[PDB]
Design a protein around this ligand. Structure first.
Ligand code: CNC
Ligand SMILES: *[C@@H]1O[C@H](CO)[C@@H](O)[C@H](O)[C@H]1NC(C)=O
Ligand SMILES: *[C@@H]1O[C@H](CO)[C@@H](O)[C@H](O)[C@H]1NC(C)=O
Ligand SMILES: *[C@@H]1O[C@H](CO)[C@@H](O)[C@H](O)[C@H]1NC(C)=O
Ligand SMILES: *[C@@H]1O[C@H](CO)[C@@H](O)[C@H](O)[C@H]1NC(C)=O
Ligand SMILES: *[C@@H]1O[C@H](CO)[C@@H](O)[C@H](O)[C@H]1NC(C)=O
Ligand SMILES: *[C@@H]1O[C@H](CO)[C@@H](O)[C@H](O)[C@H]1NC(C)=O
Ligand SMILES: *[C@@H]1O[C@H](CO)[C@@H](O)[C@H](O)[C@H]1NC(C)=O
Ligand SMILES: [Ca+2]
Length: 398
């Protein structure tokens, strides 16, 4: 099923639009995902477009080797949503060729490191999707080999990653269409296995549907909708009410749930009935598209769990974020609560605590929890409440 915001309710999407516009003033956040999101729904924003090109030219000319496969995949997707002058950058910089190498590096890392890629399966799916949409060279056998729904990389602990599953579905679906067309040849029976993979992934995605229509959490729903949009083969009308899901998301937007530009970007296309598969590299660019009218303190139980657990009661100003709690604890005791964070596009990411740093190959990371439940937001955004059992936990992907 495909549902979308009616033209009468377009005003409800304004907070998303506003959020993405403010990201112009944030040099730490990406413009690639934002511009991709906008162009996908037929929206062009000059300032953000200029920001993205600047970021792309910067990374290509002096950091291309360090750019992750998934990051390059998004760059290619953003530059080639439709045919324009900026799309030439893909072929002038040979980004598709570079993506093939980065994608192969992910594969060779899994062979060397017990099945763990350099990044993750979300990016791996982004890689296949981009290579598929832009006629890049990739092995379908490699896809059949690694994208099996039972693969551990679809799961973070015991939790199936809806985001990962959704992006995989979008990628696998592209390969399917490419196979049925004349774009790509493969060993006969590949279409069958990929279809089965997709079938299983759709079931796992729908199994994470909440009572309110959300699929996974608030921030995985948008791309989950995309995946379900293109995979109606594997579910009935009574397996999913798209309208309920849409309505719940719209409610979240009005409550400011999508204040993070990365989250706003990822949710937008589906709300307009669009998916990543609507990317037509051979022209869809409508040049005329877009007319825009324009003290109190609180206390929590903060704990750091590794094997043993260190805990204190911290007091912060009301409306403080999870990160503020961590910083207060660090001041109380740098030995025990001292941490290392890095600035990401999503925001502040916790890499190390007590000199103990998260490791990709070890499949280890720091997990944020409240009352034993994993947060849906980062430390920099999660507003804490009185009497909350806040916890940062050393965890595995399992
Ligand atoms: C892989 C993945 C992803 N993750 Co994590 C999950 N699950 N994540 C991870 C892993 C990262 C390491 C790895 N192997 O890459 C992993 C398992 C450790 C992780 C952890 C976290 N994640 C978290 C969450 C909530 C999110 N994650 C997603 C970004 C969720 C993603 C889904 C999505 N994007 O919609 C996701 C599936 C794909 C990210 C990616 O590669 N994108 C493509 C890439 C090209 O862009 P990128 O921006 O460079 O991606 C990098 C960063 O995003 C960073 N990163 C990953 N997650 C976060 C979360 C935050 C808050 C920040 C600031 C950075 C990150 O890791 C990526 C590789 O370096 C999220 C959209 C999933 C969701 N629907 O809830 C959500 C963001 C929501 C929001 N409004 O903030 C955690 C806070 C969960 C928790 N309760 O502990 C936690 C961060 C704790 C900390 N230390 O600060
Ligand atoms: C498809 O999967 C089946 C069952 O695992 C396997 O026997 C077969 O070799 C696969 N076919 C292709 C072309 O991948
Ligand atoms: C544009 O925004 C202004 C804000 O004052 C509003 O009054 C006006 O009705 C809007 N114009 C339309 C209808 O697009
Ligand atoms: C946790 O304890 C185990 C012993 O059971 C130890 O081997 C391991 O190093 C500890 N974990 C960390 C993160 O050091
Ligand atoms: C706070 O966390 C500690 C462990 O870190 C635990 O012993 C204590 O019971 C917690 N406080 C409450 C009331 O939940
Ligand atoms: C935490 O709790 C203790 C005991 O109730 C209290 O005396 C102290 O003021 C609190 N400390 C902080 C930093 O909140
Ligand atoms: C702090 O502010 C929040 C909303 O801003 C409010 O819900 C909460 O009640 C306030 N502090 C109290 C009374 O615990
Ligand atoms: C921090 O807490 C630990 C554990 O109670 C304590 O032994 C140590 O003296 C403290 N370190 C600092 C830097 O205050
Ligand atoms: Ca330190």
């Amino acid at each position: 099923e495909i549902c979308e915001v009616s033209e009468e309710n377009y005003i409800r999407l304004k907070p998303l639009l506003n959020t993405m516009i403010q990201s112009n003033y944030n040099r730490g956040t990406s413009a690639v995902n934002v511009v991709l999101s906008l162009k996908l729904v037929g929206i062009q924003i000059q300032t953000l477009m200029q920001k993205m090109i600047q970021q792309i030219k910067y990374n290509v000319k002096s950091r291309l080797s360090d750019v992750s496969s998934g990051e390059l995949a998004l760059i290619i997707l953003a530059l080639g949503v439709c045919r324009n002058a900026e799309e030439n950058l893909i072929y002038d910089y040979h980004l598709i060729d570079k993506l093939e190498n980065k994608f192969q590096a992910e594969i060779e890392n899994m062979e060397a490191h017990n099945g763990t890629p350099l990044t993750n399966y979300y990016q791996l799916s982004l890689d296949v999707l981009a290579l598929c949409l832009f006629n890049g060279n990739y092995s379908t056998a490699e896809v059949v080999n690694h994208f099996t729904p039972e693969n551990k990389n679809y799961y973070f602990g015991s939790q199936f990653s809806v985001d990962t599953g959704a992006m995989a579905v979008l990628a696998l679906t592209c390969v399917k269409k490419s196979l049925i067309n004349g774009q790509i040849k493969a060993d006969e029976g590949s279409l069958k296995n990929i279809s089965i993979y997709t079938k299983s992934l759709v079931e796992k995605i729908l199994s994470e549907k909440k009572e309110n229509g959300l699929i996974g959490n608030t921030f995985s729903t948008g791309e989950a909708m995309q995946a379900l949009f293109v995979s109606s083969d594997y579910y009935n009308e009574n397996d999913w009410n798209c309208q309920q899901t849409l309505n719940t998301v719209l409610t979240e937007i009005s409550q400011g749930a999508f204040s993070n530009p990365n989250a706003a970007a990822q949710v937008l296309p589906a709300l307009m009935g669009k998916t990543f598969l609507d990317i037509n590299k051979d022209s869809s660019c409508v040049s005329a598209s877009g007319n825009f009218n324009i003290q109190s303190y609180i206390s929590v139980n903060y704990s750091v769990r590794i094997n043993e657990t260190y805990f204190t009661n911290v007091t912060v100003l009301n409306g403080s974020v999870f990160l503020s709690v961590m910083e207060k604890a660090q001041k109380m005791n740098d030995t025990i609560f001292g941490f290392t964070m890095e600035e990401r596009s999503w925001g502040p990411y916790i890499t190390c605590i007590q000199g103990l740093c998260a490791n990709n190959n070890d499949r280890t990371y720091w997990e944020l929890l409240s009352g034993g439940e994993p947060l849906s937001q980062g430390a920099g955004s999660y507003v804490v409440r009185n009497g909350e059992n806040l916890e940062v936990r050393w965890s595995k992907y399992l």
